[PDB]
Amino acid sequence: LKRSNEAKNPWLTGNLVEEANSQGIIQNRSIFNLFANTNIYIFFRHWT
């Protein structure tokens, strides 16, 4: 683009993934979570 112009794992924690909104599959959710390392979170704390 410069050249051109896991199995058998039930839900147990519940709290970690905030989203338990809908049965089966949530269809339209504003809510979005980013899972991060240390060097992602620090880059984000330097942004806030």
Curated annotation (Swiss-Prot):
Compartment(s) of residence: Nucleus
Domain of life: Eukaryota
Functional description taken from the UniProt entry: Catalytic component of the RPD3 histone deacetylase complexes RPD3C(L) and RPD3C(S) responsible for the deacetylation of lysine residues on the N-terminal part of the core histones (H2A, H2B, H3 and H4). Histone deacetylation gives a tag for epigenetic repression and plays an important role in transcriptional regulation, cell cycle progression and developmental events. SIN3 also has a RPD3 independent function required for normal longevity.
Record note on quaternary structure: Component of the RPD3C(L) complex composed of at least ASH1, CTI6, DEP1, PHO23, RPD3, RXT2, RXT3, SAP30, SDS3, SIN3, UME1 and UME6. Component of the RPD3C(S) complex composed of at least EAF3, RCO1, RPD3, SIN3, and UME1. Interacts with ESS1 and STB1.
Further comment: Present with 1660 molecules/cell in log phase SD medium.
Protein name per UniProt: Transcriptional regulatory protein SIN3
